Amino acid sequence: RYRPGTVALREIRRYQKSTELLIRKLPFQRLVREIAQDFKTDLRFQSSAVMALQEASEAYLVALFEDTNLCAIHAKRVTIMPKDIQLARRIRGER
Amino acid sequence: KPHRYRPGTVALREIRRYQKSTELLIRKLPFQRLVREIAQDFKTDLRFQSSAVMALQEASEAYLVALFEDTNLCAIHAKRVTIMPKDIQLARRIRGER
Amino acid sequence: HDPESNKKRYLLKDFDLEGTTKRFEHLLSLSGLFKHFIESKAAKDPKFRQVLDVLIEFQFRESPAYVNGQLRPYQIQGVNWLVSLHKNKIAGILADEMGLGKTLQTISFLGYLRYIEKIPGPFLVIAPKSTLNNWLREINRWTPDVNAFILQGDKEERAELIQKKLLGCDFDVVIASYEIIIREKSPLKKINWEYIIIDEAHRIKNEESMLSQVLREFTSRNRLLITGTPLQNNLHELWALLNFLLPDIFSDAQDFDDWFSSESTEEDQDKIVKQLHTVLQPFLLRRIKSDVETSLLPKKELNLYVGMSSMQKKWYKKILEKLLNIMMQLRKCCNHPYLFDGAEPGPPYTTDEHLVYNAAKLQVLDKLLKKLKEEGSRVLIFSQMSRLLDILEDYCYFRNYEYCRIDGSTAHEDRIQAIDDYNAPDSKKFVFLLTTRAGGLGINLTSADVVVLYDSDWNPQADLQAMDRAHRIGQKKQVKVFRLVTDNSVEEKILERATQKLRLDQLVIQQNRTSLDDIDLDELLLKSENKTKSLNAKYETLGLDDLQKFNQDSAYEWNGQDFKKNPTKRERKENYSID
Amino acid sequence: TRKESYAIYVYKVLKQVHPDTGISSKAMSIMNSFVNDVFERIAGEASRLAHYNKRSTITSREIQTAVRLLLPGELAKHAVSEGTKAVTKYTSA
Amino acid sequence: TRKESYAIYVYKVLKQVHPDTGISSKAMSIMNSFVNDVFERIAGEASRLAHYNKRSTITSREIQTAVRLLLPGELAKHAVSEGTKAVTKYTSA
Amino acid sequence: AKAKTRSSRAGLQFPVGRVHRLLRKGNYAERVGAGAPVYLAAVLEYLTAEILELAGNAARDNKKTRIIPRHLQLAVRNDEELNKLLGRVTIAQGGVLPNIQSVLLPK
Amino acid sequence: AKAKTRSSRAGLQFPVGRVHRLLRKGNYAERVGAGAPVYLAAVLEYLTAEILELAGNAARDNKKTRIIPRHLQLAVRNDEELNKLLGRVTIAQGGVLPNIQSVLLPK
Amino acid sequence: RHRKVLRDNIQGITKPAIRRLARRGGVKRISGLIYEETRGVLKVFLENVIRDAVTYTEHAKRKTVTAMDVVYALKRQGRTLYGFGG
Amino acid sequence: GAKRHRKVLRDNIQGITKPAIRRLARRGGVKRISGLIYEETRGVLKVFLENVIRDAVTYTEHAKRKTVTAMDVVYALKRQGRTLYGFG
DNA sequence: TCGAGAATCCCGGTGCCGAGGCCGCTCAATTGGTCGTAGACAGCTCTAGCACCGCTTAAACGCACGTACGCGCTGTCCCCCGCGTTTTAACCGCCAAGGGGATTACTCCCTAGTCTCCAGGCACGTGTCAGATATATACATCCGAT
DNA sequence: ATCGGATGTATATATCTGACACGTGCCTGGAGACTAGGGAGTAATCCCCTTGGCGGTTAAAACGCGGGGGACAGCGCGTACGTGCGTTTAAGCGGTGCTAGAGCTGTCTACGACCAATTGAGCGGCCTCGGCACCGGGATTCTCGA
Numbered sequence A: 001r002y003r004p005g006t007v008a009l010r011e012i013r014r015y016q017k018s019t020e021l022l023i024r025k026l027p028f029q030r031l032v033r034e035i036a037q038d039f040k041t042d043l044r045f046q047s048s049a050v051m052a053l054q055e056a057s058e059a060y061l062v063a064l065f066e067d068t069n070l071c072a073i074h075a076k077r078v079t080i081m082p083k084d085i086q087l088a089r090r091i092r093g094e095r
Numbered sequence B: 001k002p003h004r005y006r007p008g009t010v011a012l013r014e015i016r017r018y019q020k021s022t023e024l025l026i027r028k029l030p031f032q033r034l035v036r037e038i039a040q041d042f043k044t045d046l047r048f049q050s051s052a053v054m055a056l057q058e059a060s061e062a063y064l065v066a067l068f069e070d071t072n073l074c075a076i077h078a079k080r081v082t083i084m085p086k087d088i089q090l091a092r093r094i095r096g097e098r
Numbered sequence C: 001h002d003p004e005s006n007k008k009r010y011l012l013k014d015f016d017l018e019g020t021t022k023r024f025e026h027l028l029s030l031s032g033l034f035k036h037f038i039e040s041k042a043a044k045d046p047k048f049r050q051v052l053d054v055l056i057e058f059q060f061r062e063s064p065a066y067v068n069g070q071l072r073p074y075q076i077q078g079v080n081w082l083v084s085l086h087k088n089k090i091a092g093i094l095a096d097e098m099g100l101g102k103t104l105q106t107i108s109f110l111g112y113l114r115y116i117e118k119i120p121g122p123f124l125v126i127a128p129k130s131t132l133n134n135w136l137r138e139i140n141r142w143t144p145d146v147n148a149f150i151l152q153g154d155k156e157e158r159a160e161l162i163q164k165k166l167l168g169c170d171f172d173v174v175i176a177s178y179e180i181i182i183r184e185k186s187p188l189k190k191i192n193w194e195y196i197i198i199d200e201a202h203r204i205k206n207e208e209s210m211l212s213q214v215l216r217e218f219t220s221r222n223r224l225l226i227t228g229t230p231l232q233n234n235l236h237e238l239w240a241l242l243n244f245l246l247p248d249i250f251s252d253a254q255d256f257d258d259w260f261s262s263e264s265t266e267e268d269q270d271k272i273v274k275q276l277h278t279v280l281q282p283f284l285l286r287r288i289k290s291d292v293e294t295s296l297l298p299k300k301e302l303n304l305y306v307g308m309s310s311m312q313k314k315w316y317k318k319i320l321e322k323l324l325n326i327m328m329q330l331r332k333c334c335n336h337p338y339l340f341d342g343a344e345p346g347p348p349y350t351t352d353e354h355l356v357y358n359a360a361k362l363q364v365l366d367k368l369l370k371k372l373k374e375e376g377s378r379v380l381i382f383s384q385m386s387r388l389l390d391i392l393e394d395y396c397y398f399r400n401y402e403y404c405r406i407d408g409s410t411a412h413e414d415r416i417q418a419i420d421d422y423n424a425p426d427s428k429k430f431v432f433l434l435t436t437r438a439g440g441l442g443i444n445l446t447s448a449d450v451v452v453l454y455d456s457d458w459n460p461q462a463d464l465q466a467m468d469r470a471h472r473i474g475q476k477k478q479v480k481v482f483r484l485v486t487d488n489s490v491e492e493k494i495l496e497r498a499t500q501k502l503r504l505d506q507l508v509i510q511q512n513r514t515s516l517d518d519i520d521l522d523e524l525l526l527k528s529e530n531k532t533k534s535l536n537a538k539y540e541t542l543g544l545d546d547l548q549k550f551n552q553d554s555a556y557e558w559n560g561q562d563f564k565k566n567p568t569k570r571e572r573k574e575n576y577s578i579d
Numbered sequence D, E: 001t002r003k004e005s006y007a008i009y010v011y012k013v014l015k016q017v018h019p020d021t022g023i024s025s026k027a028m029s030i031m032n033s034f035v036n037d038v039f040e041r042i043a044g045e046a047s048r049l050a051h052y053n054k055r056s057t058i059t060s061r062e063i064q065t066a067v068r069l070l071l072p073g074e075l076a077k078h079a080v081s082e083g084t085k086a087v088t089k090y091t092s093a
Numbered sequence F, G: 001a002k003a004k005t006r007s008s009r010a011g012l013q014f015p016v017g018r019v020h021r022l023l024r025k026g027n028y029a030e031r032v033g034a035g036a037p038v039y040l041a042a043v044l045e046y047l048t049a050e051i052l053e054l055a056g057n058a059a060r061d062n063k064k065t066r067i068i069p070r071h072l073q074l075a076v077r078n079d080e081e082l083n084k085l086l087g088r089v090t091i092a093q094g095g096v097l098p099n100i101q102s103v104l105l106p107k
Numbered sequence H: 001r002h003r004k005v006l007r008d009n010i011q012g013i014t015k016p017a018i019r020r021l022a023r024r025g026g027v028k029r030i031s032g033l034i035y036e037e038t039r040g041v042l043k044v045f046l047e048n049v050i051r052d053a054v055t056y057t058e059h060a061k062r063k064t065v066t067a068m069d070v071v072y073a074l075k076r077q078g079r080t081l082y083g084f085g086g
Numbered sequence I: 001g002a003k004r005h006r007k008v009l010r011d012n013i014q015g016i017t018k019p020a021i022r023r024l025a026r027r028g029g030v031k032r033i034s035g036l037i038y039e040e041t042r043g044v045l046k047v048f049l050e051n052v053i054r055d056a057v058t059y060t061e062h063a064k065r066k067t068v069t070a071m072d073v074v075y076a077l078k079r080q081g082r083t084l085y086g087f088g
Numbered sequence J: 001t002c003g004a005g006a007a008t009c010c011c012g013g014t015g016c017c018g019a020g021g022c023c024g025c026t027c028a029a030t031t032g033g034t035c036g037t038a039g040a041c042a043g044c045t046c047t048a049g050c051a052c053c054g055c056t057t058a059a060a061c062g063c064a065c066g067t068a069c070g071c072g073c074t075g076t077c078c079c080c081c082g083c084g085t086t087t088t089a090a091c092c093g094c095c096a097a098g099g100g101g102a103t104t105a106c107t108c109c110c111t112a113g114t115c116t117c118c119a120g121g122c123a124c125g126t127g128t129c130a131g132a133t134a135t136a137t138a139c140a141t142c143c144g145a146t
Numbered sequence K: 001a002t003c004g005g006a007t008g009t010a011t012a013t014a015t016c017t018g019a020c021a022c023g024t025g026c027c028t029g030g031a032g033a034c035t036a037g038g039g040a041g042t043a044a045t046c047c048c049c050t051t052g053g054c055g056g057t058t059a060a061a062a063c064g065c066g067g068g069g070g071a072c073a074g075c076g077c078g079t080a081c082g083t084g085c086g087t088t089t090a091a092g093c094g095g096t097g098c099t100a101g102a103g104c105t106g107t108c109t110a111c112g113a114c115c116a117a118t119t120g121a122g123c124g125g126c127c128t129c130g131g132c133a134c135c136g137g138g139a140t141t142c143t144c145g146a
């Protein structure tokens, strides 16, 4: 049996080497076309539109998680917590 | 024994008096000399207007004040009250400069 | 008399033709040309025209009884002139030479104003800071029974004096410095100011000086100016002095200019000079320095027309062709080439003879200093740039002489200590470096006898003050001015402009008081003196209309000048392997 | 119909800087969008620059200044060298 | 030497909003810069918006869409309403 | 006939004609409509009215009767959406909102 | 009178006529100079070649012949200049640079 | 269209997907409260981008959201996207 | 003597005195400052100044002038995304 | 724990300077008329987005257990803050002379735009092959427990 | 330290599918007159810059010192995560049909551009008088050692 942290590093090396999308397609499409109904009724989405939304979204989330990791490291930890995300977003100017 | 203020109670007074005024906190002449020295390294024999130096000073001071606000936030995040160069580096790197 | 009673007379608790009519009545007793200004500023200022349309002899022979000690007869005539000027509702300037004694005359006039017509103040006296103390002493020495104060110090001391004595009105004289006058005008604007006296009126020259405007904001019943030299360089400054003295008359600068200077009449000469003498005679009083003193023997001013050095020529030509942003750089090169960055050969630096021959002027300077050292004199170089003065100090060290340097960055106590030790009895102090516009007028270099103006100034008054630093009352042996000029260079231009200014001063003011490789230094001196006589004979007979031509022959030319003077592929990333 | 693109020119450049490799279609689309983006940025900067100076024409001078003003460090000087090379070769023909 | 600026119009708006209240010169210059900046933003957005749709005119619809894209949330709608109001009034006379 | 400014025709205070000229000369499009200047001028007038009212209230709070850059800064940064509009702008001679972190305060 | 393209005269690979047309119809200025399209096309060609050579090198380092978006992302992010130029740009089907903070590694 | 509007689709962004995103971002150990925060920030970002895209498509008098509309929205927000046209 | 070698004129960046950084930090709202802040602050200020002045000089050199104006600095700041109100 | 003590604030008075009316001019807006030409509407087509729907099957979910990491408490330096000299550098006021950039007015020329043709260049539609997966398959190469 | 597993890591083979090559045509870029207006060059001019130096004030900055409180390291612990197993459950693909709804083509007409005169509106120059800054001084309030 492996020890805590080994498999985490193996997953880190595995997912920093691949390029695919890490969110399933139907859940994200359902979320997108549920959100979009708040602005206009009877909207149709091309596949390319949802694909672009998903790739932009995943890029944003990865870039946010890098800053969250750096904040948590700066606070003398290895575990990312919600206050790290809040600090990163506040510093970056989004909140 | 003359009265003495506890460490940190004059810092708060300075905080709340400098954060209420509007004036520039850097002396005019040293900043002007620094600007001329930096500029003469790009192309020789420039001259500035007073308004150019004034605008540049306003921009730089606003930039530094914002950077120090983010530095204070970084320091507080680490259960500290003292700002250290680690905090400036982290704020600048998150912010996107470096 | 009483403080509370005197508060009723001093403080001002509250087109003045009343005295203006009498002023004009007496003034028009002279030539009607005086009314010319008025007949102009009647069309521009009709409200002041209401005076032109409608239209005691007190010799005071002996010295005043109330003053201590005896008073010199020419100063007696000075106070007579001052009293005459007062009893006409007009004002004049006193222009006696420095060291002749003017504070005594002014304080005797004040004693007159207090003891003969009984107006004990108020009086304001404006003087340079270094001079301030040298007033109270005389005020306390010649007429002791009068109160005065200097009104000096930090914010606390000055405010305490303002609350205590000035507003309290426990004073007769309020002697105060220029910067203090500017600093506190509001407390000083309400005293009603019987008289205002300005020693060293050179400061009040520019009409738009902050001090000038501040003084024009005051209220004075009569004014007066004390100065050693009016009309320093230009004429317009004389008009500014007159305008301050009498603003109701000399109210148009363009009038005084176009009538005389700004448009020179096609007349030859010798008429307008009589016009000016008639205009200024009632106002300006002046006496020759050598008038009643004797003793001091006239000055043997001399020129040394040095050539120029090979490196000096190379650098000067390098400057002429086009980091350097003034013509004064030329003055640096003809002064000493080492002032520029890079002139010194080799980043290791030495102090041996390798600099004496590199500079043209300093070669002759070295020769003269050696001749005087084995002749037994003392010298007072007055360069105009402290940087060259520093280089000359390094020279003085190499040749093993004794410094004494007082620049504009020398602390006051250091200044006085240097003056004392040099002026001390027999001592190892040969050379006394000093920058020309330093020390004000309280420097008393009477011990030495030889002066060397290393460079020439734009206005000759500065050089005259430098000469008077050693030619004052006191020093009674000899005086030798040895100004050095580089020929075939801009120094000729500066010398020409200075000489023309000095000649203009001699014509205007100095005519009223009449009625009131080695160069073999011997041959160099002979030819330089011949050239000086050449310029003197050339320019002495020139015309007044030409005195203001300011030919301004450009020195940028001097010999014939047209006034015209890969990609590298980047570093690349080495390895792109993900592993 | 007949959608214009930069594919042919990017391919011609690729087969002179690496004359054995290839390029996928997604990579070609990315390169096309990159070329369009950089063109738009340079052109907008040049237009604003000409508007500041009251001029009404875009010349090689404004393009050079916009290049020097948008690209960082060594890229700016290399691009300027290439542009001036091309212009001087063009005018002499 | 004539220099156009939105000084008198800002002053009129101020004196119809706060009838008794002045404004310093620096504040006036800041207001002028703000107006110019917002004008440039909206005009640039409308220009790009019309270029996207292969149109040649900037009409009121493009301005409305641009102001809807830029102004944040609840601030936009009021502005939009105001604009429409004016146009209707302007097209009645 | 008799001239009537388009601003008065639309009941505005900002210049419709000047906006039209700046829109044609700014090289935004080959043609500009007839209602575009009116719409844009109305929008600019609304925005300036909002910010001026906020600044006037701020100035009145300080017992002063002129608007100064401090009041403009103080009005902008105290409204969340007006501050989102001007998030990246610096107001010369403005300042900073009074803000001290609660951790820094004395216990 | 044989027709010679401006690209051939300038010695470039990118089209000069197309760039001229895009400048003219793009509403950038009232007039467009003659050397502006040539200069801009040269700059675009240089930038494309510069990025594309680094992409090819990255492809070769991974034992590949055809370049894919991953190689473009690696080339852009590893080079300081291009990473600064495309700082605010995300690349579809790209990825991240392999980078683990040293504190996280085992001791 | 009318497709029987659903709920709790933000829960469709499941815990392992967030963990995979964190691993790509370089995160070793993940707290248990972080998933709700991630869902919230994702919802905010999506709302902004979709609002801009819907405005762009409404201006064109269309009913279908195209990839170019999303690209324009991202560019307007300062998040340029390469690979979907333009 | 050798006094013709005046002085270093220490450095203009040191003209940004420690009290000035402390005042800027107080306006930012910090309570305590480590002793090493005063060097990092000078470094970041110098970097920002070089970045802005490079663009300003480019703008003023394209216009074929030799005098950097306030408008040039405003243009440079706007290009960097730091719009400044109050100078034109 | 209250009684000095220090800092801040709120009132009067000056006083001074700049904002805010007031007048002249000149030059953009406005009015009226003519003229293309975007774009708006109507029509036709064919394409992909919506809606299910079954199979599969691979990840998600719930659950256990057991480390190790986050947090709290305690000591100890050490370093930064508050306060008191005192020293100097900013900041005015000056002097002396240039000349050097920036800013209007004229002049004109040469370089863009605007046309009219007319051929190549490039975009679309096809028909091939080899580069990169996918499986297996054996090898070498950390991790963790004794 | 060594050994037993689990996991990447090379290595060979088949695929296919996506990239590359080749034929059509049409549309756009190039060649050649003609023109006019934008910009480059000339020249006043004049206001402000440049360098070197001086004198004096007055706060700010620099240096020194004491002492408190804050950061930093260490220890203990007790949850809260990570890791591995079974079991479903929902995604992902193929297949199908429907039809709204983008996208291309023709007409025309209403609307913006252009031009000529004219005139009110907006900008520059000027004067002045309230609003705000500065300075006592008196009261208020918070702080810190009892």
Ligand SMILES: Nc1ncnc2c1ncn2[C@@H]1O[C@H](COP(=O)(O)OP(=O)(O)O)[C@@H](O)[C@H]1O
Pocket (backbone or CB within 6 Å): C069, C070, C071, C072, C075, C097, C098, C099, C100, C101, C102, C103, C104
């Ligand atoms: N009894 C006296 N009569 C005349 N002059 C005197 C008498 N006593 C002293 N003096 C001189 O009067 C001089 C005043 O002149 P000075 O101090 O040089 O200033 P200024 O040159 O402005 O008059 C003093 O130097 C002093 O030596």
Ligand SMILES: [Mg+2]
Pocket (backbone or CB within 6 Å): C102, C103
């Ligand atoms: Mg005297």
